[PDB]
Amino acid sequence: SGAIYVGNYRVVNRHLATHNDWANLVWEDSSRDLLVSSTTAQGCDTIARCDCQTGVYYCSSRRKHYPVSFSKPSLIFVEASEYYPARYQSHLMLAVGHSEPGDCGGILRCQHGVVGIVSTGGNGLVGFADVRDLLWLDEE
């Protein structure tokens, strides 16, 4: 589990969005596994605006933050998980590391701020849904 809290936006994995998220929906995209809802209180996170390929992510199933190198966001085939069938996911970055389903929502961060959230795992990789292209998260 986990979210990004930037201004009055909550960014969550679409597959973990709650009824309150859907009832307060700003934007969602199944192909990216992202959903954005509105918040009362302003959030503590800053979104990265950059093309970094190194950062640190939180792994809840290890209670650990790991430094990783990761691929640039792209359209990738993802094998079946507990929460999605085998399918193509867009805006996905991969790193070598540990990721189980419950790790979804952990933040990947670089020197510029939050890059994305854990969205995929299995076969010794961790996949992250990028948010750095969502420039509208920083305004209105």
Ligand SMILES: CCn1c(NC(C)=O)nc2ccccc21
């Ligand atoms: C995102 C703001 N921010 C953070 N934040 C964290 C969590 O590390 N570290 C910074 C270092 C220098 C300048 C700004 C910085």
Ligand SMILES: [Zn+2]
């Ligand atoms: Zn960066």
